[PDB]
């Protein structure tokens, strides 16, 4: 149930050949045969990669093989990666290399605590749903708009690191595989998440005074076979909340 057209898999399609590429590469992104480097380990970069077509699956699960790694000493690295399922695509900006006031879903892999009064241990993975009205407060690591999150040790690991994002029937689940255990450990599991079909998958990274290599190695999108019993492209991104 792999959907190849919404995936990035080695050998990358159209790279070193006449075949149709499936992704657009934007900003500081460096394309090599063995990784897509959203930013090099250099300051003040914004790079992204965006699926060349929109996704109309109602129920899906994206697996991302990524690598964040750099030569910054002690805590002097940043800023992280965002994964996107959004109305718009290709616009750079302050939100891990991509535009603010976005429409849809963001999954942030934040590696630098901008918030001087933070309670979190970094890196910190969180999710945000936006109808266009919200601005991600980068200076505060998105504190005001975070729906859920978990600390996650993903930098400079000696083995492969993966993230899974599952969306089906209003349930959004983010899982990690960072500890070389060939298993999905839960990070976030929330319900009442409303997203339309017809949005774009993408990934972006950003660096400022602090930097890191932010690599995407592969992205594999799976269609979930889930029963349904409305115009799904017109659903406004939103979240419904269980009452107290």
Residues of this chain that interact with Ca ion (CB under 5 A) are: 110, 112, 114, 141
In terms of CB distance, is 145 or 168 closer to Cl ion?
145
59: annotated binding-site residue?
Answer: no
How far CA 185 is from CA of 80, 165, 195, 222, 242, in Å, comes to 20, 12, 24, 18, 24
Using CB under 6 A as the binding rule, whether residue 112 contacts ligand MAN is answered as yes
124: annotated binding-site residue?
Answer: no
Using CB under 6 A as the binding rule, whether residue 78 contacts ligand MAN is answered as yes
In the complex, minimum distance from the CB of residue 153 to Ca ion, in angstroms, rounded to a whole number: 16
In terms of CB distance, is 141 or 215 closer to ligand MAN?
141
208: annotated binding-site residue?
Answer: yes
Binding pattern to ligand MAN, positions 195-214, x when CB under 6 A?
------------xxxx----
Q: Which one of ligand MAN, Cl ion, Ca ion, none is in contact with 10 (Cβ closer than 5 to 8 A by kind)?
A: none
In terms of CB distance, is 19 or 71 closer to ligand MAN?
71
Using CB under 6 A as the binding rule, whether residue 138 contacts ligand MAN is answered as yes
92: annotated binding-site residue?
Answer: no
In terms of CB distance, is 29 or 51 closer to ligand MAN?
29
Using CB under 6 A as the binding rule, whether residue 42 contacts ligand MAN is answered as no
Using CB under 6 A as the binding rule, whether residue 79 contacts ligand MAN is answered as yes
131: annotated binding-site residue?
Answer: no
In 3D space, the residue among 166, 131, 173, 167 whose CA is nearest the CA of residue 150 turns out to be 173
What single string gives the DSSP state of each residue in the chain? -B-GGG-B-SSPTTTTSSSPPSEEEEET-EE-SS-EEEE-S-SS-EEEEEESS-B--SSEEEEEEEEEE----TT----EEEEEEES--S-EETBTEE-SS-EEEEEEEE-S---TT--PPSSEEEEEEEES-----GGGTTTTT--EEEE---BT-SS-EEEEEEEETTEEEEEEE-SSSSS-EEEEEE--EE--SSBEEEEEEE-SSS--EEEEEEEEEEE--------GGGPPPEE-----
In terms of CB distance, is 78 or 196 closer to ligand MAN?
78
CA distance 122 to 94: 19
Among 13, 101, 114, 145, binds ligand MAN (CB under 6 A): 114
CA distance 34 to 15: 11
In the complex, minimum distance from the CB of residue 113 to Ca ion, in angstroms, rounded to a whole number: 6
211: annotated binding-site residue?
Answer: no
Annotated binding residues, written as ranges, equal 44, 79, 110, 112-114, 138, 141, 208-210
Interface ranges with ligand MAN (CB under 6 A): 78-79, 112, 114, 138, 207-210
């Amino acid at each position: 149930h792999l959907k190849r057209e919404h995936s990035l898999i080695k050998p990358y399609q159209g790279v070193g050949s006449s075949s149709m590429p499936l992704w657009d590469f934007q900003g500081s992104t460096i394309l090599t045969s063995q990784y897509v480097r959203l930013t090099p380990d250099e300051r003040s970069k914004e790079g992204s990669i965006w699926n060349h077509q929109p996704c109309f699956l109602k129920d899906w699960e994206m697996h991302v093989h990524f690598k964040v790694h750099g030569t910054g000493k002690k805590n002097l690295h940043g800023d992280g990666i965002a994964l996107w399922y959004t109305r718009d695509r290709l616009v750079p900006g302050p939100v891990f290399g991509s535009k603010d006031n976005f429409h849809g879903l963001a999954i942030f892999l934040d590696t630098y605590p901008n918030d001087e009064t933070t309670e979190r241990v970094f890196p910190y993975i969180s999710v945000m749903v936006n109808n266009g009205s919200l601005s991600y407060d980068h200076s505060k690591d998105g504190r005001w708009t975070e729906l859920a999150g978990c600390t996650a040790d993903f930098r400079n690991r000696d083995h492969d690191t993966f993230l899974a994002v599952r969306y089906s029937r209003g349930r959004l689940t983010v899982m990690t595989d960072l500890e070389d255990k060939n298993e999905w450990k839960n990070c976030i599991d929330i319900t009442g998440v409303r997203l339309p079909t017809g949005y774009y998958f993408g990934a972006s990274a950003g660096t400022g005074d602090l930097s890191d290599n932010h690599d995407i190695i592969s992205m594999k999108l799976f269609q979930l076979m889930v029963e349904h019993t409305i115009d799904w492209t017109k659903i406004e991104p939103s979240v419904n909340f269980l009452k107290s």
